[PDB]
Amino acid sequence: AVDNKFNKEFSVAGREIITLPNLNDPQKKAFVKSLWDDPSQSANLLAEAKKLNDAQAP
Amino acid sequence: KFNKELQNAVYEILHLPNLNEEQRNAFFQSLKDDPSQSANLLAEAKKLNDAQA
């Protein structure tokens, strides 16, 4: 049983999403829930959140 | 039955500024092992966060 340390990858990715200033509250919460459910996709999900954050810049 | 309490505790613990990543990892690992302690672990994380201001 390989343990990918996916929970620690969740905390690193979740911290990065919380610091994205242009996402709104439900957007951030949606990414966090997706990270928690499938932490194997932590890097893909952070990449999507950064794309969305950059697209919503003032 | 704790999907709201878990998601809330997870989201608030991520925001706590005074925690280190290892402490933050420990709470996440306990939440994944027993989500029924979401309120207790969140209260513990905030208390720990207040003591490390």
Q: Which range marks the domain in which residue B11 is found? A: 2-51
For A29, the closest of B7, B21, B28 (CB atoms) is B7
Shortest Cα distance, chain A CAs vs residue B1, angstroms: 15
Examine residue A45 and state whether it is found in any structural domain, yes or no: yes
Which are the contacts of B45, defined by CB distance < 8 A and separation ≥ 6? B9, B12, B13, B16, B19, B23, B24, B27
Residue of B nearest to A31 (CA): B11
Q: Is the separation of the CB atoms in B35 and B6 below 8 Å? A: yes
B 8-37 → A contacts, CB under 8 A: 10-11, 14-15, 21, 24-25, 28-29, 32
What is the stated resolution of the deposited model, in angstroms?
Answer: 1.8
- The count of structural domains within chain B is 1
Examine residue A51 and state whether it is found in any structural domain, yes or no: yes
- C-alpha A37/C-alpha B22 separation (Å) is 20
Residue type for position B20: N
Examine residue A1 and state whether it is found in any structural domain, yes or no: no
